[PDB]
Amino acid sequence: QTLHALLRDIPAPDAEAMARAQQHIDGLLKPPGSLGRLETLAVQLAGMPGLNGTPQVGEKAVLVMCADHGVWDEGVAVSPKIVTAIQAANMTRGTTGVCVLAAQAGAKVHVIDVGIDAEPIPGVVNMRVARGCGNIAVGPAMSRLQAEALLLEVSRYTCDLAQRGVTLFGVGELGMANTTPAAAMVSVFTGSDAKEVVGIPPSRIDNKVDVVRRAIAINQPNPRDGIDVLSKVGGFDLVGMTGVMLGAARCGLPVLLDGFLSYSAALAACQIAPAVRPYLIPSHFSAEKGARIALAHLSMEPYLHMAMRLGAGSGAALAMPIVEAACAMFHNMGEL
Amino acid sequence: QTLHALLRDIPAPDAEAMARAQQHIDGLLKPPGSLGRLETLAVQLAGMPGLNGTPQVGEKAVLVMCADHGVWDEGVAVSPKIVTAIQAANMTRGTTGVCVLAAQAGAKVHVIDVGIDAEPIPGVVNMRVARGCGNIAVGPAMSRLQAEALLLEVSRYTCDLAQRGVTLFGVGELGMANTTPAAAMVSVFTGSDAKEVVGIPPSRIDNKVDVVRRAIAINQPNPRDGIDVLSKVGGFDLVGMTGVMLGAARCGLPVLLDGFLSYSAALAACQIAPAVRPYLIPSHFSAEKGARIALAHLSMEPYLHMAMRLGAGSGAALAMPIVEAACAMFHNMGEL
Predict the structure, then answer these.
(1) Which residue positions does UniProt flag as site: Important for substrate positioning, might be proton acceptor (chains A, B)?
(2) In which element (H, E) is residue A280 found?
(3) Domain A57-324's class?
(4) B300/A contact by beta carbon, under 8 A
(5) What is the distance between the alpha carbons of residues B295 and A48, in angstroms, rounded to a whole number?
(6) Cβ–Cβ of B101/A329 closer than 8 Å?
(7) In chain B, where the domains are located
(8) Which CATH number is associated with domain A3-56+325-336?
(9) I need a labelling partner for A138 at 20 to 30 A (CA). Which of A76, A240, B19, B86 fits?
(10) DSSP result, B121-136
(11) What gap in Å lies between CA B100 and CA B96, rounded to an integer?
(12) How far apart are CA B58 and CA A184, in angstroms?
């Protein structure tokens, strides 16, 4: 540790730098509304202390958290368990969607195993808590201590990347059955009935919903304690994405979310540490049923409508040029 | 001429190449829905015969059409008339928003004067029809023959760019008072009351609406004749953007729209030549009040929600990396 110390040292956004960036933008010669949300984004970036008082992007990293879930035994996923392992390995060879989009964005992909139920995969960053987490339908995904330790380890990993020049992160995850704990967390944090947020054959959908309600009933997660929620009805992958958000915020740097899985982690992150929120930037509006509810509770309006799902960080990589665009306009446009 | 010949020679999309691209995508190893609309976009691109049977981007050009409007005399714009000239000149120095975004996208900006009411500006492409078009509130913007000649000239200019390697266009425009004729065209083509589509002080908004109704009443444009609509209640800038769309479609190549002004031109383009439609790609969802209605009539769902307005092609430039992204995923992802 300390996780207590990390949370309390997340900096506030720098109001003076935001005022100066807004003043700079006001001094630009431009039709009214011609920047749209690029204007608000540039000012948001200017407030993040790791960006040194100005909207800028240096190196970019997308962190893809990988883990398996004991709730897979409840029949809520169609694919066999080993697919998590095969995908993590493909990510190290650069052949997945997020890899290709990250390459387009000039970003590096960091594949992090935080709990794959397989032999370790050479080339993946090894932060494995256990070989898959507990089956949330019968008990907790993990101990409170395990969730806290993984939060600290990931947040430290993320912020240490600022020493190699990284100033913009994206977060994603992969793992068979991951959408079930994500929907549980979302239902718990937002108070929405499981049926409204459970990701999309009738009996199979019902089984998924019933499993979410069962996980919540058995575990009784406390919505006012984000770490309790993660440890009881989340998973290592979700804790991992929350850790990226905490680490970026601690570093005073931007992080792009991806889809619904990452929204659920962001809900937890902002419950644990409300000071995280000014560092989060949406990318895409996930096709998962629960996307609208989760984004509402984060007061977030995504920039991209790609009808995308299961991107494993692909949406965050796709939005990286949007962040670069707000910075180029800020620095490169002519003035009044 | 001939404009008749140009319209009839717009090629159909290549169904065999689309089938082959869909087959290729089906053979990619990917979670279900993980490409989202990148999948549909790659297949759409594969159908465009100027792309030679495969989703690809070579050189990129954003064409920014510039002109003044006699309806400016009706008090529907707040800025003085010369601003159109000052902006066209700034575009040649590379200091505007669309210039900066085009540079981010690796695209060249082509600034085309199709009717600025000022001395010619050195460095701008000169296709000027007249020094501003007629005041649509009292009569037609131009003659049918003038609209037809400018359509042909611009479409030829656009397609000739395919000889310098250009495979993806963006279209935009600038011109004081341009949003008034745009709203008139949109009301005429969609049958919506002017009050629903007139771009956003109460009396000033009413004057704008009243001027649109007056233009339509006096000119009696025929909605079943897109060239009639353009010549009577449009402007040189709108005819110019329609010409880009016709030229790209004739060349069998993609064109990215921008905001509401370009939607109004796209409505005209697709009325004149329905075969244009498969070549049009939305970029952003304009903040102008009439954006939703115009996009509905084009059956178009933009990828970007940037709350942007008066971009002069900036939205199309911002969406260019989205098109490149669909191509990179298509060619670079690993297979089953």
Answers:
(1) 173, 312
(2) strand A280-281
(3) alpha beta
(4) no
(5) 36
(6) yes
(7) 3-56+325-336, 57-324
(8) 1.10.1610.10
(9) A240
(10) -TTSEE---SSSB--T
(11) 6
(12) 46
